[PDB]
């Protein structure tokens, strides 16, 4: 059922240094946020997001990532899609750390190219993941298939993967979430054209330290 990335069960600070101090928020921030739901069609090409960048300016958690400059958390992605038994096609859920959009045409990418916001960005080259990396080798990562004849959920638990044990939550970006339609979608005529895809995100053990303003 669930897929646990790298075998961690993410925990608190390992009695870190330069904390006398860091607060542990209550269950006002441990609630299931639900982002917007895209639409997947016959000629669609892909989506991706960034973390913890899509959770900013949103909820109680938005009111802590912009008034603290030390941050540490782990997430619980819960991707779910709904479709009847007369449609076909297969998705792909992958959680890649250190996701870099390269840029094209022999020319650095823009601002909204690399930090999408809540509405996630699309690809242009799904075959090479916009980093020159083939999709054929792209299952070393924690992956979980959504296949529309068998199952309709894909649960991924992600620990805090980072070099420095406290980084910021505005400039740096821990990882990203790609959703790539490997199979094309076909369906017999008369039925519904678009099939939605929704997400669900819940923080596990978020800490904060150091206050601004």
């Amino acid at each position: 059922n669930i897929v646990l990335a790298y075998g961690e069960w993410p925990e608190y600070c390992p009695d870190t240094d330069a904390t006398a101090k860091p607060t542990r928020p209550d269950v006002s921030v441990n609630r299931f946020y639900t982002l917007d739901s895209k639409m997947w069609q016959e000629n669609s090409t892909g989506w991706y997001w960034k973390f913890p960048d899509v959770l900013n300016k949103t909820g109680v958690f938005g009111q802590n990532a912009q008034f603290h400059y030390l941050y540490r958390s782990g997430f619980c992605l819960h991707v779910q899609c709904n479709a009847s038994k007369f449609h076909q096609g297969a998705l792909l859920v992958a959680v890649i750390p250190e996701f870099v959009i390269a840029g094209r045409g022999s020319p650095h990418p823009g601002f909204t190219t690399t930090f999408p916001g809540t509405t996630g960005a699309t690809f242009y080259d799904p075959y090479v993941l916009d980093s020159g990396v083939p999709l054929s080798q792209a299952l070393i990562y924690p992956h979980q298939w959504i296949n529309l004849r068998t199952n309709n959920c894909a649960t991924v638990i992600v620990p805090y993967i980072n070099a420095v044990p406290f980084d910021s939550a505005i400039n740096h970006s821990n990882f990203g979430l790609i959703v790539i339609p490997v199979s094309p979608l076909k369906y017999s005529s008369g039925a519904t054209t678009a099939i939605p895809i929704t997400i669900t995100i819940a923080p596990l053990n978020s800490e904060f330290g150091g206050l601004r303003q």
């Binding site: 750390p97 045409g105 022999s106 980093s131 020159g132 083939p134 070099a163 400039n171």
Partner: protein, 219 residues
Amino acid sequence: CVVNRNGVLETTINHFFSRSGLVGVVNLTDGTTGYATWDIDIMGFVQLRRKCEMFTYMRFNAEFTFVTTTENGGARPYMLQYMYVPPGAPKPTGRDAFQWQTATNPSVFVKLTDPPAQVSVPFMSPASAYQWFYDGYPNTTYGLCPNNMMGTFAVRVVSREASQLKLQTRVYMKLKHVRAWVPRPIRSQPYLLKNFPNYDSSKITNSARDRSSIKQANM
């Protein structure tokens, strides 16, 4: 033909980087500057670049070797100087400036007729490990990590007389006690920039050559 097995001493991660290779070429040409600077970066050739981007966090010491010839081949005796700059100090500007007599810069004086010099460098980053990918901002400020600065070498001949030598110096590199943390797939597209993964999407190479059809197994 082969029925037995083999060992697992050679597939390990310590042996996968252990043998040494070329990383750089510098030129002195004292007649006319009189020295040559060179940055420390393992992203010099594509052969070592394609291996070391199979991971994301590494931690490793290093050790170098400077092997020098002349232009013709006749190695007359002289005395060179291989300096080293820890990251934060200003680089040399002229051949006789006051950055050649400090005490923070470890110097290595070796002749030419002697067998080549050898020196090791400890791990020198404020982070717990290096990074080869950094998503964010510390347009041109994108992806430039301030935590890979390792230093220079600044080769300089030692004289008072401005000798007429024309030298070439190679730098070899070996890695030790390598510990790699998380994997990632191997890059297929060729390289365009030294420090950016851009790939010229006007034309894309494939990963397999074509064939006749799908029903003929013989290629």
